[PDB]
RNA sequence: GGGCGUGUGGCGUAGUCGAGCGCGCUCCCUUAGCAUGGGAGAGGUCUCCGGUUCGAUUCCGGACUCGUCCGCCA
RNA sequence: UCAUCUAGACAGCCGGACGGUGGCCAUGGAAGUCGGAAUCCGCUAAGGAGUGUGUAACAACUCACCGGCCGAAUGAACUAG
């Protein structure tokens, strides 16, 4: 029924992900189940399910998966069917199944593995080392729809104990690291997706998604284990060294900025750990890419990139804080990039953008990275002009205007100049006279509690009555 | 997911199915794979009704649907209307429309908030749409295509429009609908995108010949991730 | 019909023999279609191959745009004007013979259909039902 | 001896019925991995004609690629090369007789 | 339908098994006109495919193409 | 018309089917089996300087020959009713 030998694999002598003596790899060309092992399978029905899984067509793959699930559901009848041999074969195919583009295939595969673990509890211990990292990768996924059922099922498998879940991270941290390393470095878009059946695009898109999930898993690993960084520093270094994580930070292209955001979270984690400070080259490379990302941000795609911008600013403030803005020193044109970014960012209003700008301004002012009068004051004023034009056409605007004012007032406080104060008063007056639904809206009025003295407000009210 | 499905070989799923947030409608003469796609992806939370509209297997082009209401043509029989009333939840309202154009899926492109209609519909039908669906209505054509339901796919998150559409028409329709719109193709280049696929907040179902860049455009514009 | 049929069709009374000229309902720039053949028709001595509603025919554009004239192309009959019976027993008919242009797989050359189409044609061809305004 | 090993490895993959393009991708991956057998094989493979070309070092540095038929034994493949040499020698002899008369 | 013969450079045309000339125009020189001549140029899968030979334009077999000749009824 | 035959024939099973010798030329090799010639002895009950499969060449297997069981006719080529 099954013929041939994986002679090349025997020469290779690499078990890859698998620690059970069976090579497990994400790539299509290798890691396919060995023919002899498939022959060793307990039943003809099992052999057929495996052949269908091997076949490329999704509809056929799904039908086979459904059949496999049915066998698992009737565990008492099929306990004999399930065997260590089946488990070894399943592990090798499972890795390919998780990488599969189709959502249902992934969801079913995770469900199948969890069901198997519950039924075979205490008998899958040998295979747990192979299974758990893959299961965890599914649980932490960029896509919420696949991840949530998987996470709930995992908790149910472990009898709803959070501590057990945390323990799993600690027990498999080395294994998780190997998996993350393999995805980040060993895997390539070409390995993940066949060149003939897939375009240059999509293959790249797929690779980015897979690595992003691994990065998310990595962030989780750091959070779960404080000591993980120290024990596996060499592995962590290589993963960080690889440009692929950095390649993820591209804002020029890609459907979502979520992947870019995930990397930003990792960078903040590196800063909190001090791992990036400990290894200088990685930190420098990350900073350079972040500066490049600022260039990538453009007016044409600003609407898409606007939610992500406040997050970038907060990260910049932290990196900027480090070492008195050595981050700026790394790039000669970094200041120019920031100024260009500022103009692009201001044109599209975003929630939290002003707060980030003020925080960045505070970080810059210690080293005078941005001149208050030359660049920041005009920029803040331009932001007010933009806000006044958008009065409150897409409210939200009301909170944004208040957010700007609070930050602008603090920015104004650090001027000690009459002209700056006069400009602030004039801008406030211009916004107030033009008005909008702000008098009607309690929230807008309450949020901007004061931009002028109470007596001045009374004087303005008196002036309005006095005015013709 | 944009789920690859065929209706017995047909790569046009919007013709034979109508998908909203609250319910789904499928034709009675359907294959096991075609039913299994909606049963697996939708789950048990959302009812799937096997229905016939006016004696026809085509139901997506005959009916226009919303989470608040469903519109059916005059030719729909009392048995089909009673079966839809029993199978559907109590929240949705089903009302017959007495209007000459009579193919409501072709005539009306609608979502939860805002709707695009054929320009030449009757005023009583426009008020009936605004009453039953609770949806504000605009009479507009997509670059001269009067069949806005066939030539647009619309959801709450975003919209896919006809590929040969003027850019000025794209920002005009985008500002009018308050959602981002992308010109694109479905089912290996077929122009009829609304007939090509169905979409809601978390699911899109398309034909098997829909290629990978087209599917990527679908999931990008409808934010299904 | 033949290849691109989505299901089967009950027998409709044949109303369009070979040589019939019908209106061209779509917006492809052709004015009339001249029927030269019916797909799936049988063989009998002296009997003309006739078409009904929902049938796919071979047709030439006798009047219209010069890049559509002087060549044969497939067409789909959408309006019949000869009265036929349904299984609910209503006898119905349009007031003109009308068809649209298609490829051998059945997708329309044009983009919109003016006037009504029959449900026996709209059920059998989904692209016609997609571009159709009103289905009766 | 090495040639026989190479053939067995390639044959095993073919016996599996794996896609020929897929087999080639694997060979490339093994070369990156540093597998010795993988290194020997030239990357383009005439699987259609069932011939694999493997580089053989001239001196036990320069390597001469030699096409090997998968079906034939390594020694059999060698005999065929010898046979081509033999035929060429026969042709040369005929040419030598021909030249004097032809020149006249 | 059948028979017989035919196929060379952009054009015409010479070929005994060991592709030349002329015409078109590439360049240069040359012109009191009623615009020539001269000198070096480019230009072929010898209709195509197989075998023989040592090598076929050359011999042979097949196919394509063209041109001739003869052919249904009362 | 040739042959074999109760001193054991032809089918069917079972056993041996060997040395000189890897005979002489020729080949990168060819040892019975790519070919060219010769084609002889020993031991024999019997075994070809080989009938095929067979390997790079080997090795290996089988033959046509001899033997136990069987006990009596049989094999090849050709002719014409
Ligand atoms: Mg007749």
């Amino acid at each position: 029924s099954f013929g041939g030998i994986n002679t090349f694999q025997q020469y290779n002598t690499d078990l890859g992900l698998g620690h059970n003596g069976v090579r497990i790899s994400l790539n299509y060309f290798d890691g396919l189940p060995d023919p002899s092992l498939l022959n060793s399978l307990y039943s003809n029905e099992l052999k057929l399910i495996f052949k269908s899984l091997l076949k490329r067509d999704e509809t056929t793959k799904e039908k086979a998966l459904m059949d496999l699930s049915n066998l698992i559901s009737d565990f008492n009848q099929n306990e004999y069917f399930f065997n260590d041999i089946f488990l070894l074969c399943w592990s090798q195919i499972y890795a390919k199944l998780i990488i599969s583009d189709y959502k249902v295939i992934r969801l079913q595969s995770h469900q199948i593995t969890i069901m198997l673990v519950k039924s075979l509890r205490k008998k899958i211990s040998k295979f747990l080392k192979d299974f758990i990292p893959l299961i965890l990768l599914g649980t932490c996924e960029l896509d919420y729809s696949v991840s949530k059922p998987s996470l709930n099922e995992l908790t149910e498998c472990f009898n709803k104990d959070p501590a057990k879940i945390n323990a799993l991270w600690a027990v498999f941290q080395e294994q998780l690291l190997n998996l993350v390393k393999e995805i980040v470095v060993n895997e390539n878009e070409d390995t993940i997706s066949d060149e003939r059946y897939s375009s240059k695009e999509e293959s790249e898109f797929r690779y980015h998604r897979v690595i992003a999930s691994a990065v998310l898993l990595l962030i989780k690993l750091f959070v779960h284990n404080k000591d993980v960084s120290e024990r596996n520093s060499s592995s962590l270094k290589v993963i960080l060294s690889d440009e692929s994580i950095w390649k993820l930070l591209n804002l020029k292209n890609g459907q979502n900025t979520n992947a870019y955001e995930t990397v930003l979270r990792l960078i903040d984690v590196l800063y909190t750990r001090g791992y990036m400070p400990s290894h200088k080259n990685i930190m420098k490379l990350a900073v350079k890419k972040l500066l490049k990302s600022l260039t990538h941000i453009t007016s044409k795609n600003i609407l898409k990139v606007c939610p992500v911008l406040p997050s970038i600013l907060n990260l910049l403030a932290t990196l900027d804080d480090y070492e008195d803005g050595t981050i700026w020193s790394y790039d000669k044109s970094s200041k120019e990039k920031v100024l260009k970014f500022l103009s692009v960012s201001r044109t599209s209003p975003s929630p939290g953008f002003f707060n980030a700008v003020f925080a960045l301004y505070s970080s810059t002012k210690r080293h005078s990275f941005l001149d208050y009068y030359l660049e920041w004051l005009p920029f803040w004023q331009k932001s007010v002009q933009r806000l006044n034009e958008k009065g409150f056409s897409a409210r939200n605007s009301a909170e944004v205007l208040n957010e700007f004012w609070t930050n602008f007032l603090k920015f104004a406080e650090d001027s000690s100049e009459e002209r700056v104060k006069k400009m602030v008063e004039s801008e406030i007056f211009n916004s107030l006279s033009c008005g909008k639904s702000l008098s009607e809206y309690t929230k807008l009025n309450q949020t901007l509690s004061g931009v002028f003295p109470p007596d001045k407000w009374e004087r303005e009210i008196e002036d309005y009555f006095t005015s013709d | 997911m944009a789920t690859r499905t065929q209706f017995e070989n047909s790569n046009e799923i919007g013709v034979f199915s109508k998908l909203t947030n609250t319910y789904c409608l499928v034709a009675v003469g359907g294959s096991e794979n075609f039913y299994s796609a909606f049963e697996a992806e939708l789950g048990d939370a959302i009812p799937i009704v096997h229905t016939t509209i006016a004696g026809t297997r085509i139901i997506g082009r005959m009916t226009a649907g919303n989470r608040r209401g469903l519109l059916v043509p005059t030719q729909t029989t009392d048995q089909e209307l009673q079966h839809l009333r029993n199978s559907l939840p109590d929240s949705v309202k089903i009302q017959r429309v007495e209007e000459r154009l009579s193919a409501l899926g072709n005539v009306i492109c609608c979502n939860d908030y805002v709707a695009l209609v054929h320009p030449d519909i009757d005023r009583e039908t426009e008020e009936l749409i605004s009453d039953v669906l609770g949806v504000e209505v605009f009479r507009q054509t997509i670059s001269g295509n009067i069949l806005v339901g066939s030539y647009c796919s619309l959801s709450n998150q975003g919209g896919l429009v006809h590929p040969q559409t003027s850019v000025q028409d794209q920002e005009e329709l985008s500002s009018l609908l308050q959602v981002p719109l992308v010109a694109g193709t479905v089912n290996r280049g077929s122009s009829v995108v609304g007939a090509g696929m169905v979409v809601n907040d978390y699911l899109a179902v398309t034909g098997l010949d829909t290629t990978a860049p087209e599917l990527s455009v679908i999931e990008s514009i409808f934010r299904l991730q | 019909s033949g290849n691109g049929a989505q299901g089967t069709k009950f027998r409709i009374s044949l109303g369009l023999p070979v040589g019939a000229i019908m209106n061209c309902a779509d917006n492809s720039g052709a004015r009339n279609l001249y029927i030269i053949a019916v797909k799936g028709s049988g063989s009998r001595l002296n009997r003309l191959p006739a078409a009904s509603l929902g049938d796919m025919v071979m047709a030439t554009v006798k009047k219209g745009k010069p890049e559509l004239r002087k060549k044969v192309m497939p067409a789909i009959v959408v309006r019949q004007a000869k009265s036929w019976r349904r299984r609910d027993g209503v006898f119905l008919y349009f007031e003109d013979n009308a068809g649209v242009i298609a490829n051998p797989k059945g997708e329309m050359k044009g983009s919109a259909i003016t006037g009504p189409v029959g449900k026996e044609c709209a059920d059998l061809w989904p692209r016609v039902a997609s571009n159709s305004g009103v289905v009766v | 001896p090495l040639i026989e090993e190479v053939k067995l490895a390639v044959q095993g993959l073919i016996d599996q019925q794996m896609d020929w393009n897929t087999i080639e991708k694997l060979i490339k991956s093994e070369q990156k991995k540093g597998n010795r057998i993988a290194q020997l094989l030239n990357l383009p493979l005439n699987l259609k004609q069932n011939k694999i070309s493997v580089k053989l070092d001239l001196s036990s540095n320069e390597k001469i690629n030699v096409t090997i038929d998968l079906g034939l034994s390594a020694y059999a493949n060698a005999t065929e090369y010898f046979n081509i040499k033999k035929t060429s020698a026969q042709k040369q002899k005929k040419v030598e007789k021909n030249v004097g008369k032809a020149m006249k």
Side-chain angles (χ1 to χ4, degrees), chain A residues 1-79 81-254 256-389 391 393-394 396-417 435 450 453-454, chain B residues 1-31 33-43 45-78 80-81 83-84 86-89 91-92 94-99 101-123 125-177 179-187 189-207 209-214 216-225, chain C, chain D:
Chain A
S1 177
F2 300 98
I5 295 292
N6 282 331
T7 338
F8 275 101
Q9 305 309 310
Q10 296 171 341
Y11 297 132
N12 197 23
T13 74
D14 186 23
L15 302 184
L17 295 174
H19 323 95
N20 276 239
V22 275
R23 172 171 174 86
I24 304 181
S25 53
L26 312 179
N27 45 13
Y28 64 98
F29 30 93
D30 59 88
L32 290 165
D34 199 64
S36 70
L37 212 57
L38 289 167
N39 283 312
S40 304
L41 288 174
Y42 183 84
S43 83
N44 41 20
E45 185 182 9
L46 286 172
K47 299 185 180 186
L48 292 191
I49 297 179
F50 274 80
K51 295 176 178 182
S52 179
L53 289 175
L54 293 173
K55 293 289 293 304
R56 287 190 56 251
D57 190 30
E58 265 69 33
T59 76
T60 69
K61 279 167 162 169
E62 190 176 4
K63 301 183 176 187
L65 278 178
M66 189 59 61
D67 297 351
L68 187 54
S69 80
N70 298 347
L71 291 188
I72 307 168
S73 302
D74 210 340
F75 180 68
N76 305 1
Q77 290 189 8
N78 298 124
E79 52 198 8
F81 279 56
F82 305 127
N83 280 316
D84 288 356
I85 311 174
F86 161 74
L87 294 165
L88 296 156
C89 291
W90 168 253
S91 66
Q92 304 174 270
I93 76 177
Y94 183 42
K96 294 179 175 49
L97 291 174
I98 74 185
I99 311 298
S100 170
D101 298 344
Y102 286 63
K103 184 190 62 184
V104 278
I105 300 300
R106 297 191 295 256
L107 190 58
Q108 291 182 21
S109 300
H110 294 309
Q111 292 165 343
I112 276 180
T113 315
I114 297 183
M115 287 176 60
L116 280 170
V117 164
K118 299 187 58 68
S119 64
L120 298 157
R121 56 178 307 178
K122 210 182 175 57
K123 295 176 294 176
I124 21 80
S125 307
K126 320 154 47 185
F127 304 93
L128 271 192
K129 304 173 302 181
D130 304 4
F131 290 142
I132 295 299
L134 310 174
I135 292 175
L136 284 183
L137 183 64
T139 64
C140 296
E141 189 165 343
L142 257 277
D143 194 5
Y144 180 73
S145 59
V146 203
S147 69
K148 188 56 178 176
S150 304
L151 181 63
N152 291 358
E153 283 170 346
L154 184 67
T155 329
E156 187 258 345
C157 172
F158 282 84
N159 302 148
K160 298 162 296 183
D161 189 24
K164 274 181 183 179
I165 310 297
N166 303 339
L168 289 165
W169 289 79
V171 176
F172 299 88
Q173 58 194 144
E174 181 194 10
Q175 283 78 11
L176 286 178
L177 242 355
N178 184 33
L179 168 70
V180 173
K181 180 213 60 182
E182 173 158 332
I183 300 179
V184 175
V185 192
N186 303 355
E187 302 296 330
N188 284 146
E189 309 100 1
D190 297 351
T191 74
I192 301 298
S193 326
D194 186 28
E195 36 187 0
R196 306 168 295 122
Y197 294 121
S198 178
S199 47
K200 201 54 167 55
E201 67 267 7
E202 316 295 326
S203 300
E204 262 83 278
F205 171 68
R206 296 179 47 176
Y207 175 66
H208 297 136
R209 282 192 55 178
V210 181
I211 180 188
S213 298
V215 167
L216 183 61
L217 190 69
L218 189 58
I219 297 175
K220 298 176 176 302
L221 201 55
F222 277 83
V223 168
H224 281 85
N225 311 319
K226 303 306 166 57
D227 295 351
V228 67
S229 333
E230 288 80 21
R231 64 213 304 169
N232 282 158
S233 297
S234 55
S235 78
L236 290 174
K237 284 170 59 180
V238 79
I239 298 171
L240 290 181
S241 294
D242 196 24
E243 55 181 1
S244 305
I245 308 193
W246 318 127
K247 288 317 170 186
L248 253 43
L249 299 144
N250 173 240
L251 288 170
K252 273 188 307 179
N253 301 354
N256 56 346
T257 62
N258 305 351
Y260 169 83
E261 181 189 359
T262 308
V263 195
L264 298 188
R265 297 168 58 181
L266 177 69
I267 300 176
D268 192 26
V269 189
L270 295 174
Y271 181 65
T272 312
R273 286 300 238 261
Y275 202 78
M276 56 155 40
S278 302
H279 302 97
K280 295 180 183 49
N281 298 352
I282 282 92
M283 181 179 51
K284 297 166 190 175
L285 195 45
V287 168
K288 293 168 191 307
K289 196 60 205 296
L290 194 53
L291 288 161
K292 291 168 183 56
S293 92
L294 297 181
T295 80
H296 301 150
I297 304 168
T298 22
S299 58
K300 47 166 182 296
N301 51 50
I302 197 53
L303 303 174
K304 313 173 56 180
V305 196
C306 72
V308 104
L309 309 179
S311 312
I312 309 176
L313 289 178
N314 300 342
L315 185 61
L316 279 173
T318 55
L319 289 170
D320 186 349
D321 162 65
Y322 164 78
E323 245 190 355
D324 210 17
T326 302
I327 55 168
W328 309 123
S329 80
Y330 295 142
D331 206 326
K332 309 300 171 57
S333 302
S334 60
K335 183 172 179 175
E336 279 74 23
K337 295 171 170 66
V338 171
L339 296 173
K340 162 195 173 57
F341 160 74
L342 286 183
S343 64
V344 175
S345 61
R346 68 171 173 89
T347 58
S348 169
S350 54
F353 157 58
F354 302 101
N355 294 320
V357 166
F358 182 75
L360 186 58
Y361 152 74
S362 180
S363 198
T364 59
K365 73 186 179 179
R366 316 163 317 177
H367 32 73
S368 301
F369 175 60
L370 297 177
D371 177 333
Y372 178 104
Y373 301 99
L374 261 305
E375 306 147 6
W376 299 92
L377 186 58
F379 168 74
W380 293 79
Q381 284 161 1
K382 284 159 186 53
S383 299
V384 67
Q385 182 186 5
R386 168 65 188 176
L387 310 190
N388 289 3
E389 286 154 350
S393 58
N396 155 67
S397 177
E399 86 92 12
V400 150
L401 185 68
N402 165 51
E403 171 200 346
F404 158 75
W405 279 118
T406 307
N407 293 306
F408 181 60
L409 285 173
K410 292 179 299 181
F411 166 83
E413 285 158 10
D414 199 17
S415 70
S416 188
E417 261 201 16
Chain B
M1 191 176 257
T3 308
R4 304 291 221 300
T5 314
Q6 284 183 354
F7 192 82
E8 284 182 344
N9 289 319
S10 173
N11 297 291
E12 285 185 343
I13 312 298
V15 186
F16 302 104
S17 70
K18 172 66 59 186
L19 182 55
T20 72
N21 305 323
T22 55
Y23 54 81
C24 177
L25 305 174
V26 292
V28 294
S31 49
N33 292 8
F34 174 81
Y35 294 145
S36 293
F38 288 93
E39 282 152 353
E41 269 73 349
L42 289 171
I46 300 302
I48 310 175
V49 182
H50 305 252
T51 177
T52 303
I53 297 296
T56 63
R57 293 188 316 177
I58 58 160
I59 53 164
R61 318 270 52 93
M62 291 285 218
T63 57
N66 194 8
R67 64 191 320 290
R68 274 174 296 276
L70 183 63
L71 302 169
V72 285
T74 311
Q75 294 144 48
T76 316
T77 62
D78 302 279
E80 298 159 346
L81 195 55
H83 174 245
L84 286 171
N86 303 336
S87 303
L88 269 293
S91 60
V92 298
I94 319 176
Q95 184 34 260
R96 288 179 179 173
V97 192
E98 294 83 4
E99 190 276 331
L101 277 296
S102 181
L104 295 172
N106 287 331
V107 175
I108 313 162
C109 184
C110 58
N111 65 103
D112 298 344
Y113 298 152
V114 65
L116 285 183
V117 295
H118 191 278
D120 291 331
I121 62 170
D122 186 74
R123 173 220 40 61
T125 298
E126 173 188 17
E127 295 161 359
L128 183 63
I129 290 164
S130 180
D131 186 74
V132 175
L133 306 193
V135 175
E136 209 281 329
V137 182
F138 300 109
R139 300 163 173 264
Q140 184 66 41
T141 59
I142 314 162
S143 191
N145 281 345
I146 53 175
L147 274 77
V148 294
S150 304
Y151 287 92
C152 182
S153 189
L154 194 56
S155 79
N156 297 340
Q157 280 72 62
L160 188 78
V161 293
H162 181 73
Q164 287 69 240
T165 305
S166 166
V167 190
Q168 294 82 17
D169 292 331
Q170 297 176 18
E171 69 272 14
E172 177 198 7
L173 286 176
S174 177
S175 308
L176 201 60
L177 294 174
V179 298
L181 307 187
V182 159
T185 59
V186 66
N187 305 331
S190 164
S191 61
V192 297
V193 289
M197 51 85 87
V198 285
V199 65
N200 58 2
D201 297 355
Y202 63 92
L203 179 62
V205 183
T206 180
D209 308 314
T210 310
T211 67
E214 296 166 350
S216 303
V217 164
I218 292 306
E219 59 197 6
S220 164
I221 198 53
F222 293 121
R223 263 299 300 114
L224 303 148
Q225 299 297 321
Chain C
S1 168
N3 302 343
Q6 213 74 70
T8 68
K9 186 183 68 143
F10 294 152
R11 178 178 169 85
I12 297 182
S13 297
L14 305 171
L16 296 169
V18 166
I21 284 178
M22 55 172 174
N23 295 323
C24 181
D26 62 2
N27 54 326
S28 44
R31 304 281 301 310
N32 43 41
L33 306 174
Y34 172 88
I35 295 172
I36 76 174
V38 187
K39 302 285 292 181
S41 66
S43 299
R44 185 49 161 87
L45 186 63
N46 297 311
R47 176 170 309 172
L48 301 180
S52 74
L53 183 135
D55 287 9
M56 178 185 257
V57 294
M58 301 315 278
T60 69
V61 178
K62 278 307 187 189
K63 182 166 68 176
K65 291 174 71 175
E67 293 83 3
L68 316 169
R69 314 195 51 246
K70 296 183 79 72
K71 56 201 61 172
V72 65
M73 71 215 67
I76 291 175
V77 179
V78 307
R79 282 199 293 273
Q80 184 178 2
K82 152 74 185 152
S83 85
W84 82 96
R85 191 187 155 271
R86 296 180 170 168
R87 313 291 211 251
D88 53 297
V90 287
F91 282 83
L92 73 165
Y93 58 100
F94 302 92
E95 66 182 1
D96 72 314
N97 316 287
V100 303
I101 318 184
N103 64 6
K105 289 186 287 294
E107 65 183 1
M108 271 175 87
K109 182 75 172 294
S111 83
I113 310 187
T114 81
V117 304
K119 60 183 281 291
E120 301 86 340
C121 174
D123 294 19
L124 183 62
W125 309 92
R127 206 56 59 90
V128 173
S130 304
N131 311 333
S132 66
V134 54
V135 178
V136 296
Chain D
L2 66 97
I3 291 180
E4 283 286 341
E5 304 158 6
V6 175
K7 290 166 38 193
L8 293 174
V10 182
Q11 194 61 228
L13 300 292
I14 301 183
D15 292 346
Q16 306 199 358
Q17 279 188 177
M18 202 187 300
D19 192 334
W20 288 356
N21 307 123
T22 49
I23 293 175
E24 292 194 3
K25 274 296 294 294
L26 181 48
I27 302 301
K28 297 189 178 185
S29 182
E30 293 293 329
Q31 291 198 347
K32 306 161 191 171
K33 289 156 174 179
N35 197 341
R36 177 188 77 266
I37 305 291
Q39 304 170 346
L40 295 165
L41 289 165
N42 289 99
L43 292 180
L45 294 175
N46 203 352
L47 293 180
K48 188 183 60 62
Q49 294 182 184
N50 219 31
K51 301 174 183 180
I52 47 164
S53 50
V54 35
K55 322 170 308 183
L56 301 177
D57 296 51
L58 274 169
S59 57
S60 60
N61 191 25
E62 178 61 42
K63 309 181 184 182
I64 173 182
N65 313 341
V66 183
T67 55
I68 292 294
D69 299 358
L70 272 153
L72 294 178
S73 81
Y75 284 97
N77 287 297
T79 65
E80 281 200 348
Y81 278 117
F82 274 105
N83 291 343
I84 312 171
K85 168 206 70 64
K86 285 174 160 175
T87 59
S88 180
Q90 302 152 9
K91 298 161 192 170
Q92 181 181 359
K93 306 300 165 297
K94 286 189 292 293
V95 169
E96 293 281 353
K97 306 163 179 54
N98 168 57
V99 168
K101 51 163 186 177
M103 273 326 297
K104 301 164 188 176

